[PDB]
Design a protein around this ligand. Structure first.
Ligand SMILES: CN(C(=O)Cc1cccc(Cl)c1)c1cncc2ccccc12
Ligand SMILES: CN(C(=O)Cc1cccc(Cl)c1)c1cncc2ccccc12
Lengths: 304, 304
């Protein structure tokens, strides 16, 4: 019993972290096989960040300008290339600690763990969701760029995020491991609109199922609703509209609890219209949307 | 910016996890140097747990009855001894992945990370606090016994908790690494009173300082209070009384923000008396007490 915002064990990722330095800028890199991946803005000075011409900036750099250090040992850089907003530094040594891995582009509303790093050294691990507006509400300070987000399935690490930037609003933006930003962001020091965010409806429903499994049941009511009726409410409260694809992924939780998905939607509808009345659900006084249906089943039934 | 319930990177601990099996019972063990540590109830069957005579049960066991497997490789057990509620299985091989470590008994109100494990395999990591009543509000299923709690300071893992039991109320109890339970608990299947819990006042104040550092400031008011006045309020709301030792550990956060500790106590006093009025602080609608003053400074200013 109990329900926590749980991250994947970070060991497999810790073994991949390196420090990358170019000129006077230092950030984190990810060393997998014989390639180190890092944000391309490692080649910028503060003066360059207003509007960097990354192609021109990178032309001034040679392999020997990228200093890559794995703990205390130095990696020899034998090639460099820019792919979208990431640099890929070919090194002469395959990382002996490379886990089985994949690069994936996650969908908005999915979750992942972040290993925050500074100077190539891991500092902490936390779980978060990719917001519907493609920002993440992380915890990152200067020096965290190049930290990565990931999911783990048995022995395979699926890397989905590399941290690049903190927006003026304090939320975070980054790329997949091919250097493509999530969302409309560009790697330059300008104010950039994130756009309207929404609450991840299917995750709130998943977490209400987690609450019932863990014994918090005060919010279950005698009502039901339809997808159309529930979606009128979701619109009013800035929640994502629920689709049959979301109902389908909630099937396992619906079977575990015996609570039909539309009956749980009626409980969520009443919580949205009445609030929590000073009560709590799984130690929260707000409706939580950072647990997917897969996360809930993994945490409530077991997976290692 | 941002503020998350961050755990230490778990890699150093993942390397220590093993599976321990005795008869038909399997749980987790911690392999440090040439010793594996695990809950002594690995020697019990379900019939024994009502009131086990651990001494008599252990006398029936020999070294060859404890099966210890580190991933896929088997460890040879060459000695066994019970210390309080833990077993210590001497093995013929020092764990090559043993990090620098210490065993510490944490104080109530302190925090630590938990690496939840099943069958010696790490499944997730989360941060939590040792409650003032010596329980932890973890997330653990059957098979999680032997999972450990820890803190990391640079390269040293300080192990503070080993998971033993879930109480009928769904909260958790365990021991230090010398097998001494935190709190009044005994390792037997009986209903056991945890006793009145309280909110960790100094951590709530630390988290209000984290909120101000991150830009959530709506709760700052034009008031101040005294320790005596604040403590009348803390009593009414079941918070721990604040002492000068707590004020002293809040000094760094008070200097960082320029907000005198007693002025922050007046903000906490008003939040306790008026509630949050439908507002949030650091994405929470409740007052958070699982961040110590050390945690806040580590997360807001940096430490790897
Ligand atoms: C280094 N950094 C940047 O945003 C730098 C940057 C500025 C502009 C564009 C890009 Cl692509 C990168 C940061 C990242 N995360 C969190 C930060 C907290 C405080 C200070 C800077 C933080
Ligand atoms: C295995 N276990 C025990 O409490 C066993 C036990 C029972 C009685 C006393 C002791 Cl010392 C141990 C558990 C631990 N954590 C969480 C649990 C969730 C569900 C089912 C059991 C869980």
């Amino acid at each position: 019993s109990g329900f926590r915002k749980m991250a994947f064990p970070s060991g497999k990722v810790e073994g991949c972290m390196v420090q990358v330095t170019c000129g006077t800028t230092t950030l984190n890199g990810l060393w997998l096989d014989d390639v180190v991946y890092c944000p391309r803005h490692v080649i910028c000075t503060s003066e360059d960040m207003l509007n960097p011409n990354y192609e021109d900036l990178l032309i001034r750099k040679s392999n020997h300008n990228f200093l890559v250090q794995a703990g205390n040992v130095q990696l020899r850089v034998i090639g460099h290339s820019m792919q979208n907003c990431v640099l890929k530094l070919k090194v002469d040594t395959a990382n002996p600690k490379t886990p089985k891995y994949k690069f994936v582009r996650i969908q908005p509303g999915q979750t992942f763990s972040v290993l925050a790093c500074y100077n190539g050294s891991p500092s902490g691990v936390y779980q978060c969701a990719m917001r519907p507006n493609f920002t993440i509400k992380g915890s990152f300070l200067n020096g965290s760029c190049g930290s990565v987000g990931f999911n783990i399935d048995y022995d395979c690490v699926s890397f989905c995020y590399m941290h690049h930037m903190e927006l003026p609003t304090g939320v975070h933006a980054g790329t997949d491991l091919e250097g493509n930003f999530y969302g409309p962001f560009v790697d330059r020091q300008t104010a950039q609109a994130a756009g309207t965010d929404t609450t991840i409806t299917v995750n709130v429903l998943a977490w209400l199922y987690a609450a019932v499994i863990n014994g918090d049941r005060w919010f279950l009511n005698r009502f039901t609703t339809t997808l159309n009726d529930f979606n009128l409410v979701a619109m009013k409260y800035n929640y994502e509209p629920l689709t049959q694809d979301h109902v389908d992924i909630l099937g396992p939780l619906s079977a575990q609890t015996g609570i039909a998905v539309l009956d749980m939607c009626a409980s969520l509808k009443e919580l949205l219209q009445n609030g929590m009345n000073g009560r709590t659900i799984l130690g929260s006084a707000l409706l939580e949307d950072e647990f997917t249906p897969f996360d809930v089943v993994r945490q409530c039934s077991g997976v290692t």
